[PDB]
Amino acid sequence: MPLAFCGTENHSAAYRVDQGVLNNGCFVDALNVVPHVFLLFITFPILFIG
Amino acid sequence: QDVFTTLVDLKWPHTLLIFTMSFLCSWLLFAMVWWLIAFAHGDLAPGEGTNVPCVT
Ligand SMILES: CCCCCCCCCCCCCCCCCC(=O)OC[C@H](COP(=O)(O)OC[C@H](N)C(=O)O)OC(=O)CCCCCCCCCCCCCCCCC
Ligand SMILES: CCCCCCCCCCCCCCCCCC(=O)OC[C@H](COP(=O)(O)OC[C@H](N)C(=O)O)OC(=O)CCCCCCCCCCCCCCCCC
Ligand SMILES: *[C@@H]1O[C@H](CO)[C@@H](O[C@@H]2O[C@H](CO)[C@@H](O)[C@H](O)[C@H]2NC(C)=O)[C@H](O)[C@H]1NC(C)=O
């Protein structure tokens, strides 16, 4: 039972991005993660120079 | 604006913080992108099929 961004239940079959990737109830969450991990890692050097 | 003046000015422990954090932030951001794209193609779903993954 290793860690998982989505849910390993249903014998780990929830990653199927079919029926459109945007209709993946988990992938949209990943897209929302991206802007946060973009700002943090474009500002950390600037905040540290400060 | 004169960023590269500041980077030389700073002390060695602070310079190593900037050093380490620049590299690690770059590594982790691009790791996020690799994760997302190889997930969009479906290569993350286990036993999806014979579809050749875009990154093995
Ligand atoms: C009368 C004519 C005037 C000029 C007219 C030009 C017309 C051009 C049209 C518009 C194009 C401009 C595009 C700029 C957009 C980005 C600007 C930016 O980020 O820099 C902004 C600043 C300073 O630069 P500036 O104030 O713009 O200088 C230009 C101007 N001539 C000036 O000197 O005023 O830059 C900084 O202050 C940079 C700090 C450097 C610190 C080092 C770390 C960088 C952080 C990002 C990476 C971090 C590391 C992690 C890697 C992640 C990988 C994605
Ligand atoms: C209490 C809060 C107060 C806040 C005030 C300011 C904070 C300053 C902190 C001061 C204490 C820091 C203790 C750090 C212990 C290690 C020091 C070290 O390795 O440097 C050894 C030397 C330099 O000596 P220095 O004393 O750092 O000199 C700085 C001086 N002030 C100057 O400006 O000159 O370094 C060199 O001359 C470079 C040799 C490098 C050779 C090998 C590289 C080792 C590091 C490589 C990076 C490793 C990163 C690992 C990250 C892992 C992340 C998971
Ligand atoms: C879970 O994955 C399976 C296959 O991708 C699908 O449905 C499963 O299969 C059995 C047999 O048809 C169904 O009765 C169940 O609904 C599912 N099994 C289990 C253990 O739940 C479907 O894609 C997914 N279903 C759900 C509810 O997540």
CA–centroid distance, A18 to ligand 3, in Å, is 15
The answer to whether A12 and B31 are in contact (CB under 8 A) is no
Using CA atoms of B1, B6, B8, B11 in order, give the dihedral in degrees to the nearest 10.
-160
Resolution in angstroms, to 1 decimal, for this deposition?
3.9
Per-residue three-class SS string for B1-56 = CCHHHHHHHCCHHHHHHHHHHHHHHHHHHHHHHHHHHHHHCCCCCCCCCCCCCCCC
The separation between CA B35 and the C-alpha centre of its own chain, rounded to angstroms, equals 10
* C-beta of residue A9 within 8 angstroms of C-beta of residue A25: no
Does the distance separating the beta carbons of A49 and B7 come in below 8 Å?
A: yes
Experimental method of this PDB entry: cryo-EM
Query: Residue B44 and residue B56: Cα distance in Å, rounded?
Result: 10
- For chain A, the residues before each gap (C–N > 2.5 Å) are none
Residue A17 Cα to chain centre, angstroms: 13
Q: How far is CA A25 from the centre of its chain?
A: 11
Residues 6 or more apart whose CB falls under 8 angstroms from that of A25 comprise A14
Contacts of A12 in chain B (CB under 8 A): 46
Contact A28, A19 (CB under 8 A): no
Give dist(CA B46, CA A13) in Å, integer.
Answer: 8
